[PDB]
Curated annotation (Swiss-Prot), chains A, B, C, D:
Residues with the N-acetylserine modification: 1
Gene Ontology MF annotations: ferric iron binding; ferrous iron binding; iron ion binding
A Pfam short name: Ferritin
Taxonomic placement: Eukaryota, Metazoa, Chordata, Craniata, Vertebrata
Protein name: Ferritin light chain
Signal peptide from the UniProt entry: none
Protein keywords: Acetylation, Cytoplasm, Cytoplasmic vesicle, Iron, Iron storage, Lysosome, Metal-binding
SUPFAM superfamilies in UniProt: Ferritin-like
């Protein structure tokens, strides 16, 4: 039941629902990452705040996709959200590597959906993805790559020292 | 060495580097145009300022392309910048004709790169070019065409008079 | 064609044109340096901003020289701008060493032109160079020497750590 | 009688007095030029104001020289001020040509005095001349050359029309 649907394929509708699941799973992963760094035996609050902000960003992305689904006359369908891949996330370096792997997976899912939009001649969809998602992914992944490089440079030698300094001097408070 | 590169072809990376060279060459051409109109034996300051503003715009375009190259994980490679095609630029009319030829050449290079982006299924690139470059080119070329028409209308008959009036009454101070 | 030229030798006019080329080449070199430090596998943004500011300063110096050329009745002549001497710039230390070598070369070119001005009894030229260029070079070179010393002190031992700390704690954001 | 004179030659003292006479004569010439353009049968007020401003500038230059003469312990000596070379100044073009000839003569007198300062190892004098006079002359002469070119471009054909337009659209009110 929709009186508005136009040029919106069932394939795209389904892929949008899958992307919502991916974004919510990413949000959940970042929630876990954030709280891990808030453990009293980890205690790197700049890292807590970095991942918590990302958890909010991914939730907002899911909600944007859902708003779009309804604007086009598609129907939201939700699936179980699988728990994050790890319970403990290791070092800041380990975490930032996991985060980049995650973002690349989201980016590829966006690219896949854009390709589907192109195949389906759905310019509203393809533009929607670029404006709210594809640009943001490129920016985020560059930031994460920058952070990885700085973390790596700081290892040495004296990993504890480097981990503290990165959190204090790069990450925001 | 990049930990971020995704869906960014070597072909696109190379074409972006070439486009940077084209934008810097255009900036250099406009620098020459601007100072020519500041000669005491030319002395058309509205024309100086018009071309100097364009020199800044083209430099900014090059820097935007370079920022994008790094955001995608490509590697900037710079080449020699060839000197402008002329040392003396003739009349305002001659100059404006040269400027339009230049802008059309930049526009075609942007269109060529967009086509490559399309062939390579690189929507981030294609959107980047449209947002920061393709729209601006259309606007600029329309402005230049408008100016050419006004300059042409003012020739007569009394070319000196017309050249002065255009600079005084159309171009900004 | 000039109705204004007075006490301005052909030798000085030519040397001013050469100096414009040197300043533009320096600007181009700093543009390359800046973007190298913005690479995701380098990621030292304080260093990016340091060199980008210098690129702007050198471009402004070229434009000042060109304005002066026209004020004196000389004629700007532009030459090809050779690409920077390197595509990759190594460490912050390597880069700062290259920058000092570059500035000393500009300074010597200014000194050479001042000497020519003196030989030609051209006090407007000699004063112009001192006011806008010679003072600024001394200040800049002292700053670079200061930075080199601080970078060198930070090597150790733990070069990665030192490189990060210099960028965080000395260079501006 | 002076208790302050140091490194200030009689040659320089005399040349400064001569330069005062030249500046006052220039001021007087511009006073005549200004009022000529205020004649009801000439009536080009932008031109009146242009020359009257120059009359003030030249008077101020004379006073600066006189202040300097006393600061150095030299003694002002005034001579008769010869009347301007013409009673009627022809067209704006004629006037602007006369003005440039006048400024070049002042500039050469400044250059001559700077050379004397150099020969006499009098750096206070040479710097004084550059700061307050040599820079200002270059700027003024460039402005006059610019105006001459614009006036010349406007002749045609229709000289009356061009003369009116220059006064209305270039000169200030």
């Amino acid at each position: 039941s929709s009186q508005i649907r136009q040029n919106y394929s069932t394939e795209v509708e389904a892929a949008v629902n899958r992307l919502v699941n991916l974004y919510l799973r990413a949000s959940y992963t970042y929630l876990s990452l954030g709280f891990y760094f808030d453990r009293d035996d980890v205690a790197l609050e700049g890292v807590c705040h970095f991942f918590r902000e990302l958890a909010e960003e991914k939730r907002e992305g899911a909600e944007r996709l859902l708003k779009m689904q309804n604007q086009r006359g598609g129907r939201a369908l939700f699936q179980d959200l699988q728990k994050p891949s790890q319970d403990e996330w290791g070092t800041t370096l380990d975490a930032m590597k996991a985060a980049i792997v995650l973002e690349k997976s989201l980016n590829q899912a966006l690219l896949d959906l854009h390709a589907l939009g192109s195949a389906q001649a759905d310019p509203h969809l393809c533009d929607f993805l670029e404006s709210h998602f594809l640009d943001e992914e490129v920016k985020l992944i560059k930031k994460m790559g920058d952070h990885l490089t700085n973390i790596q440079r700081l290892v040495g030698s004296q990993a504890g020292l480097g981990e503290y300094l990165f959190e204090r001097l790069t990450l925001k408070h």
